[PDB]
A paper describes a structure:
pmcPhospholipase C-β (PLCβ) enzymes cleave phosphatidylinositol 4,5-bisphosphate ( PIP2 ) into inositoltriphosphate ( IP3 ) and diacylglycerol ( DAG ). Their activity is controlled by G protein–coupled receptors (GPCRs) through direct interaction with G proteins. PLCβs are cytoplasmic enzymes that must access the membrane where their substrate PIP2 resides in the inner leaflet. They contain a catalytic core, a proximal C-terminal domain (CTD) with autoinhibitory activity, and a distal CTD with structural homology to a bin-amphiphysin-Rvs domain important for membrane binding. In this study, we demonstrate that Gβγ activates PLCβ by recruiting it to the membrane where its substrate PIP2 resides and by orienting its active site.
Residue numbers in the entry: 12 to 92, 97 to 470, 574 to 850, 867 to 881
């Protein structure tokens, strides 16, 4: 039921806006249009050149009172400064939550900005628009070329030369072949640059012997075409998924297989005889029908009824910072970016107020950073708590205010800002008695829970907390922190609404010492882990180390995107970006038990066996440089193999072909926790793209994988071509041993 991106009628034609820059302090009058496929937001600016904004890279559009107000008096004199409030709209785009740009537009009509903001936020955060197929990204590149015209309304050659900048001579060679004007400028009329000419230009620019090898291997030892039984047997032999059932996902019939030939083959002579040439099969391999993940993977199809303790929750740590821990600058924008990305547990370190006024502020503990006040932070959390996923957001207070007047001021702020969302009273079905589990995420849709006390040197400043008052301890009902004594002692206590906060090193000690008791603890209560205090440059531990034993709130640092943050943002993308993933069956049922450090297969869990072979790649860069591709697998410490690599291609960043043996992962013990990680690098270590695929729902056969950038935003051109084969498994000093097992996962 996930819709395709549909551009409404009032955006295809476009309205008028008054784009104002705060820096240049200027006024222009532009017209905002969205192209009919839903790819760009383009406008003809003052310099007669069409500016474009990629609509997939929009983080937030905010209008009304949340929009940016001008602080230059002369630009308010220009705009004439309360109906003038709601005619504002700002668009927030960028490649990571830190380095965001702003685009300010003021409408000229009456009540258009609300419709424009809502339609742009719907077109940006779409699910099927992000997980598209390969042909859609090629058409996205074509629409990018068709929009950006010059002052004479033609397409200059320099845009085509800046697109495929990994060569020169083949570009004008193929343009001379296809019948195009190759020159310095050449002023190409857009009528003679339709989509078929673009497809001919790409097919004569990049020759594909790999698809010729695939056509050689799938039974076309006769040259030209494919018959119905050959194409049907290719699909039903290679492209199946043998883990599923043959009665729920039925095999392909020729009556359904004729529609693919009627849809993809361009040649009318092969079509009447029901055949498929090479030019049609190459179009088939990147369509809607043959993707890398099925559409059930990203749809909100997870059973959201289980207790809250059975859910990996996307969390953050020191969300106010934007740089290193010591001398950073605190900012309120990072709360909005974290909540709009999909984080659900943010942090607040509150401090006491000054003599002359009274206000608590948020900053790091005496390391000489900046200061933001608490009211703006709570307003930003109230604004962007449910703009992306209607599911409960846990606030994590780290209180330091010792003057109870300011504590009652903070409690009154929290009550007056949020409203009905804040969980001020416990629920009817679930009381706070020893014996009853936590509520469900479905029961708390749209609510906000706080985490405060209710009446060391490595932990940072989060160990000298202050005791509560009778005002701020009313709000703490379901998630209340408590000091951790033992596992059997906190298991005989049987109070499910407790939770404990660890530091990274104490959690590593508890994981190496007694893992089964840690898993049995995590079936009932919540447990949050934050990184240590030694990390002054905002590094990240690998969160799989604590996802293995069922920790729910594994807090990370959102400012820097290393491999840990890449894995976190990649694995919480599924389940509709809701921020909640379900734990597997053997870590939330109280009768089953298993060791997380096992090395043989676990009874009652069906193992898998995966085999990945990289074939080729396309348009991976914009310069002559080599390319190599990495394949890693995270998971349980028996499954984690992150050594594999391919040989470096020579100077082919345009169509390199690798040719070696596949990478075998022949015994995956717990398959519904492993996460395959394909990544491509230039020679020397420059990052190109990566892609996170879970092993529980990856397809088999030849597929196109479209790489993403560091913050999981879809790149247009670069795309690998892999061949995977998933199948069911057919069988043929202690602390030293635990650290030896954890070495490859730590890295
Ligand atoms: Ca903190």
């Amino acid at each position: 039921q996930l819709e395709p991106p549909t551009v409404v009628e009032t955006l295809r034609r476009g309205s008028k806006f008054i784009k104002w820059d705060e820096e240049t302090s200027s006024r222009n009058l532009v017209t905002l249009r969205v192209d009919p496929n839903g790819f760009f937001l383009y406008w003809t600016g003052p310099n007669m050149e069409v500016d474009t904004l990629d609509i997939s890279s929009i983080r937030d559009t905010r209008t009304g009172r949340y929009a940016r107000l001008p602080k230059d008096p002369k630009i308010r004199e220009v705009l004439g400064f309360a109906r003038l409030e709601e005619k504002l709209m700002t668009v927030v785009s960028g490649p990571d939550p830190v380095n965001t740009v702003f685009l300010n537009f003021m409408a000229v009509q009456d009540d258009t900005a609300k419709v424009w903001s809502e339609e742009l936020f719907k077109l940006a955060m779409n699910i099927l628009a992000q997980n598209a197929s390969r042909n859609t990204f090629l058409r996205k590149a074509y629409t990018k070329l068709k929009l950006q015209v010059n002052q004479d309304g033609r397409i200059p050659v320099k845009n085509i030369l800046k697109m495929f900048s990994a060569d020169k001579k083949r570009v004008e060679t193929a343009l001379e072949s296809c019948g195009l004007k190759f020159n310095r400028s050449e002023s190409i009329r857009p009528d003679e640059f339709s989509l078929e000419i673009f497809e001919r230009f790409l097919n004569k620019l990049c020759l594909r012997p790999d698809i010729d090898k695939i056509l050689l291997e799938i039974g076309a030892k006769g040259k030209p075409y494919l018959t119905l039984e050959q194409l049907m047997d290719f699909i039903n032999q290679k492209q199946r998924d043998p883990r599923l059932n043959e009665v729920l996902y039925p095999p392909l019939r020729p009556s359904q297989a004729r529609l693919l030939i009627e849809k993809y083959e361009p040649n009318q002579q092969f079509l009447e005889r029901d055949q498929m040439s090479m030019e049609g099969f190459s179009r088939y391999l990147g369509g809607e029908e043959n993707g890398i993940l099925p559409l059930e993977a990203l749809d909100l199809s997870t059973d959201m009824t289980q207790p809250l303790s059975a859910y990996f929750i996307n969390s953050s740590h020191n969300t106010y910072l934007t740089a290193g821990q010591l001398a950073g600058t605190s900012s309120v924008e990072m709360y909005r970016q974290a909540l709009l990305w999909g984080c659900r547990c943010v942090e607040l370190d509150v401090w006491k107020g000054r003599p002359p006024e009274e206000e608590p502020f948020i900053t790091h503990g005496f390391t000489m950073t900046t200061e933001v006040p608490l009211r703006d932070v709570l307003e930003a959390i109230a604004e962007t708590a449910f703009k992306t996923s209607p599911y409960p957001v846990i606030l994590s207070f780290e209180n330091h205010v010792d003057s109870a007047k300011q504590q009652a001021k903070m409690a009154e702020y929290c009550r007056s800002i949020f409203g009905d969302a804040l969980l001020i009273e416990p629920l009817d079905k679930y009381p706070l008695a020893p014996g009853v589990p936590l509520p469900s995420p479905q029961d708390l849709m749209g609510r906000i829970l706080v985490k405060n006390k209710k009446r060391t040197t490595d932990e940072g400043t989060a160990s000298s907390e202050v005791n509560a008052t009778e005002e701020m301890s009313t709000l703490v009902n379901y998630i209340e922190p408590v000091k951790f004594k033992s596992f059997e002692a906190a298991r005989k206590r049987n109070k499910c609404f407790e939770m404990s906060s660890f530091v990274e090193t104490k959690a590593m000690e508890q994981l190496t010492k007694s893992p089964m008791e840690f898993v049995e603890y995590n079936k009932q209560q919540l447990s949050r882990i934050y990184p240590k205090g030694t990390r002054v440059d905002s590094s990240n531990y690998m969160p799989q180390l604590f996802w293995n034993v069922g920790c729910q709130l594994v807090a990370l640092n959102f400012q820097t995107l290393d491999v840990a943050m890449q894995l976190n943002a990649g694995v919480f993308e599924y389940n509709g970006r809701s921020g909640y993933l379900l734990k597997p069956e053997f870590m939330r049922r109280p009768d089953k038990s298993f060791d997380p450090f096992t090395e043989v297969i676990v009874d009652g869990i069906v193992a898998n066996a995966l085999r990945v072979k990289v074939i080729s790649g396309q348009f991976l860069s914009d310069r002559k440089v080599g390319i190599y591709v990495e394949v890693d697998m995270f998971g349980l410490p028996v499954d984690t193999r992150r050594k594999y690599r391919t040989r470096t291609s020579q100077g082919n960043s345009f169509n390199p072909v690798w040719d070696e043996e596949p990478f075998d992962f022949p015994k995956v013990v717990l398959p519904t926790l492993a996460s395959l990680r394909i990544a491509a690098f230039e020679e020397g270590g420059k990052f190109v793209g990566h892609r996170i695929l879970p092993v529980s729902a990856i397809r088999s056969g030849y597929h196109y994988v479209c790489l993403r950038n560091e913050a999981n935003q879809p790149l247009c051109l670069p795309a690998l071509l892999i061949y995977t084969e998933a199948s069911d498994y057919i069988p043929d000093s202690l602390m030293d041993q635990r650290a030896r097992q954890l070495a490859a996962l730590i890295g």
